A paper describes a structure:
Two host-guest collagen peptides (GPP)4-(GXY)4-(GPP)3, where (GXY)4 sequences are from the α1 and α2 chains of human type I collagen, were recombinantly linked to chains A, B and C (corresponding to α1, α2 and α3 in collagen nomenclature and omitted here to avoid confusion) of the NC2 domain in the following combinations designated as α1Aα1Bα1C (for short 111), α1Aα1Bα2C (112), α1Aα2Bα1C (121), α2Aα1Bα1C (211) and α2Aα2Bα2C (222). Three unique chains form a parallel α-helical right-handed bundle.
All five constructs were screened for crystallization, but only three of them yielded crystals of sufficient quality, crystal structures for 111, 211 and 121 were independently solved using the MAD phasing from selenomethionine derivatives (thereafter designated as 111sm, 211sm and 121sm) to 2.25 Å, 2.10 Å and 1.6 Å, respectively. The most deviated pair is the first trimer (chains A, B, C in the asymmetric unit) of 121sm versus the second trimer (chains D, E, F) of 111sm (r.m.s.d. of 3.01 Å). On the other hand, superimposition within the NC2 domain demonstrated high identity of the trimerization domain and adjacent residues within the triple-helical portion. Namely, a triple helical chain linked to chain B of the NC2 domain is always in the leading position, the one linked to A is in the middle, and the third one linked to C is in the trailing position.
Numbering used by the authors:
A (entry chain B): 1 to 71
B (entry chain A): 1 to 64
C (entry chain C): 1 to 72
Amino acid sequence: GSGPPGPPGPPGPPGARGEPGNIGFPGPPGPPGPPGRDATDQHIVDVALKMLQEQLAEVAVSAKREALGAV
Amino acid sequence: GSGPPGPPGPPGPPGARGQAGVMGFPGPPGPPGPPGRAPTDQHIKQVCMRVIQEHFAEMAASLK
Amino acid sequence: GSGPPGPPGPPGPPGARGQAGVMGFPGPPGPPGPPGKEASEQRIRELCGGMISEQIAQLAAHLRKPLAPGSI
């Protein structure tokens, strides 16, 4: 008749390989850029000088036209 | 002849670790900086005052 | 052990998920801002015309060539 039951079977196969890691989160935004440069005084100086030249030149025109009676 | 098969074997070992995930995308550029300063009315007046005061000799030449 | 070996065991568990991806790099600084807006020639003329007239008149008086009378 029967001999004894056999020994335990072999270990099962290894499990399937794991899935790839989760995706990284996006990086932070960069900081704001530096401030723009301030407007320089040059444009103001230029107009002030133009105005001065204009008004001074008009003093002479005024004197001439006063003498002519044609202001 | 034979006898019964033996008991079932143990479970196999765990599978291999998965590959590392991809790095996230870089962040966006920061916003532009603030605008530079525009001249105030008081600042304009002060520049004009300085220009006048530095040209008294030139004014005098045209007023003689 | 006259009988044959038992059936194989079941498959092992699936392997662990891989290491998570790292956070992305920071973005770059943004660009410099726009330059400051220059005052208009017209606004400069509005703000400074009067003082120029006044100072011209005062200097003319100093030099003893006072001018056409100015606006009240």
